[PDB]
Design a protein around this ligand. Structure first.
Ligand SMILES: [Br-]
Ligand SMILES: [Br-]
Ligand SMILES: [Br-]
Ligand SMILES: [Br-]
Ligand SMILES: [Br-]
Ligand SMILES: [Br-]
Ligand SMILES: [Br-]
Ligand SMILES: [Br-]
Ligand SMILES: [Br-]
Lengths: 291, 293, 277, 272
């Protein structure tokens, strides 16, 4: 089960039909002339007959290519209509702003931002979900406009893929440190860690061999807010972003470990991304406020 | 001649950072070896990918066409690894726990802390997950995870029975209550409503009861995260229906008040379950399970 | 070209829809459990909204999932109609046997075979298309019935009947006056992949065995070529095999015919039984 | 540890041949090297891919799931290389030629002493007229051979497409040996011809030549393809007195006027 139709071939066929020239069509499809010739060939293998005569000038349709024209458009339009009909299903209303961020930004940063701008945003219905699908999946949704903004850290692992950068705008929301914290009682030490897969594990783990203490891992999760609850409860040392523990540091239920050894801290920037082509007014009024 | 897999990330890394030195550090090799890798990649592909005489370094026309090839291969290699990855157990005193994101911050740590000296000797690994209950039941069966915490499941349609495979116990019974910031209490007309996304358990529990009500709730804000509703409600953005266990501290600090105290039947009952595999007898899992009952 | 719809997601959708269990849908789709779950997510990301209700056991459709059902069916149906409306579009007459082979075989083997059987084959028309496509493309066209027979070299398959036509060696040959300049197959060609690992100053490189031979007959250097191509020249001593005593430099090959088990047109089976021997 | 792509071909060889000695030979490594590679791939993917509990070796269930992944990954490497491949310039004196079997050898040998030091890469080609002419000015090819704007051109020779038959044939409708529908020579012959009975079809002149030598019918072929078969009385020209059913055609060579390679120019000065 692996000779499937690839829809890209349908556009390749339409482009060569219209332009009559392998070099021009490849350019219009953003691929090398060889990539493009191979794709047309793969289409012809799949449909089973040659669609183009290469011995005429310019390239023309065969008898079979003529017959195939309505089949190519028919499918291409069905995919388009499918994409368009469901593009609006994400939108409750045209004044709702769809937002994806790290869980700890969904609980600490985003409400603080709306609440501070509550009057200037009072007409907007924010819809806030945490990042859970994988960084590339969420950026694809941003580019497709099924998501309006994306709040991330400026870590390497949360960068948008290189092919996508040109299509996105980003602004900095503020700067921060990831710092180690414990409850007042302090001295081997119980370690409260990020699961090795998630984004913050890669920021913190290199810093940790510089550490002089042996670390007794007793709890790992993916969410900073979970580590914070255990650090409060006296369970170990965790690395957490500062603007997760503001009042906790004030109430002295937590305190920074080796406070004046700033190189066991990691500076990070909170980023907000949008698609340059997403011109929905509700999204624009929101972006104007936090930027 | 063999294409070398790490040339691809080598390529991506030098395309992003503008320079060899930074790219070589990002890839944890000598400035030296990085150069040699980039050169082997260019020899192999047959054309220059990088215009090296530009500062910062840019891609050639070829390098620009090369971008999707490197990403697809990288992605297809990673996808090959993840599709075949097996269940893992780090240490034999690690308890593997799966649940929704919300439960992972306001239920499990409280549970864990309340049994510290009993559970202190175990290693707890909590991976929140938006995969379905069907996915998590399957993980219990595969012993790829040990415990699942969840809100009770009303079946959409008749389903195969489970107690030949899974055991279930009740962690907590409580209510989902409407809360509001104290300043807003006397204004309670048309009320701003801080609601759950339609594809959460709590929406499917709250909205049925909410339609049966003489309120005019205008949705001003939507989320999957109970903890976000709570922040919004503290700031007076409107009324939220939230589980009691998420607001224990806010109610004690008088930063939130239950609204419509008089109408107890506007508080929606809810159970939090812990599921386990019947064929899984690890003493770490039993020590954990025997403590929550 | 960033984010294509992938046809197979449509079948993944319908299969999870009807079975309501990730593990069972995955088995039905012949993929691993985590590959299926990943593919389902790719479909939901692409469309932009969840199609399956994740709080439910068994899994059931969201309202968006319910809405999406005709879209998926109609796409799949259209792809199927496209394939149907073009099946056997290449088949001109019904007494036509469509043949694909390598260039080397289209001149040195196939004409010799039809003549050898001219009167058992007189009622047929043969279209011989020498082809450069991968063997996998040729196998797929056999399954689709886009061609009828495949002749090739050698050293899915439950729908493909094969048969050995001739066993042979690729041997180094040279004009007698010589006792080293190299006449080679271009990188991509099949015999290239065959000869080189078993292996000289390059002087001439092409795809076609018969170009090598003319150059070899002309004293231009040494070429490796299948034996059947050079039977006359060996007889007439226009070529001799080089280091003939040392079978080390000679590569055995096999000349194969494949047909699809699902193609039962008379004209093909007739051709085949004269071929099988 | 990183994936090595030669493992994927190692996997497919063992799957096809079902035996370690045979699989190692087909991959040109020692049996022990082949073994260490198979084990390294099984460690990398994390599950056993081969069922060693019998002979021939078969695939595990996961091994059978892994098959499409090996093929896909290997296809994508191969496409990556081909989509960028170009300009096979092994020597300062390599001549990359695009075009026709009998032509190039005859021409090389006709002046081998003058082109001793060169080496030729000849390639049979069916992309566009446009595409190939661009490649000449892209300097990705040095020479373009073809039948009949800053491109010098050269008459190889002007010859004639003629109909040929085995002498054994005295004769009315006739078995007709034709070029396939979408080839250049079809566009030259079928217009002139407009009773023939289709009997055999292909794209290759040399293939039609052998059918005609066996007497299977009449074919039109360029004479530079049959100069020897005529001299050997194996084919004659049909309808000799019908001198107007022979299509006159030219053979041309093209080179870019900015492609200033000495080897290219040396070849070109022998050709004209
Ligand atoms: Br298909
Ligand atoms: Br085709
Ligand atoms: Br994520
Ligand atoms: Br987080
Ligand atoms: Br673990
Ligand atoms: Br929920
Ligand atoms: Br083949
Ligand atoms: Br070959
Ligand atoms: Br890897």
């Amino acid at each position: 089960m692996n000779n499937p139709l690839e829809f890209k071939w349908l556009e390749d066929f339409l482009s060569l039909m219209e332009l009559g020239n392998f070099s021009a069509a490849a350019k219009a499809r953003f691929v090398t002339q060889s990539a493009f010739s191979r794709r047309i060939q793969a289409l012809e293998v799949w449909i089973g007959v040659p669609l183009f005569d290469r011995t005429s000038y310019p390239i023309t349709l065969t008898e079979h290519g003529q017959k195939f024209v309505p089949y190519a458009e028919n499918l291409l339009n069905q995919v388009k209509v499918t994409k368009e009909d469901f593009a609006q299903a994400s939108l409750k209303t045209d004044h709702t702003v769809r937002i994806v961020c790290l869980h700890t930004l969904a609980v600490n940063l985003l409400p603080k931002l709306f609440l501070q701008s509550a009057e200037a945003l009072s007409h907007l219905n924010l819809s806030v979900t945490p990042s859970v699908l994988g960084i590339d999946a969420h950026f694809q949704m941003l580019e497709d406009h099924s998501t309006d903004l994306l709040f991330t850290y400026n870590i390497s692992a949360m960068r948008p893929s290189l092919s996508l950068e040109d299509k996105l705008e980003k602004c900095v929301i503020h700067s921060e440190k990831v710092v180690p914290v414990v409850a007042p009682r302090l001295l081997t030490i119980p370690y409260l860690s990020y699961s090795e897969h998630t984004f913050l594990s890669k920021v913190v783990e290199p810093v940790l061999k510089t550490l002089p203490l042996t670390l007794k891992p007793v709890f790992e999760t993916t969410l900073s807010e979970s580590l914070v609850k255990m650090a409060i409860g006296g369970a170990g040392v965790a690395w957490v972003p500062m603007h997760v523990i503001e009042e906790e540091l004030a109430q002295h239920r937590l305190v920074i470990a080796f406070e004046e050894q700033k190189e066991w801290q990691i500076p990070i920037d909170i980023l907000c991304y949008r698609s340059t082509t997403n011109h929905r007014a509700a999204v624009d009024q929101f972006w104007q406020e936090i930027d």
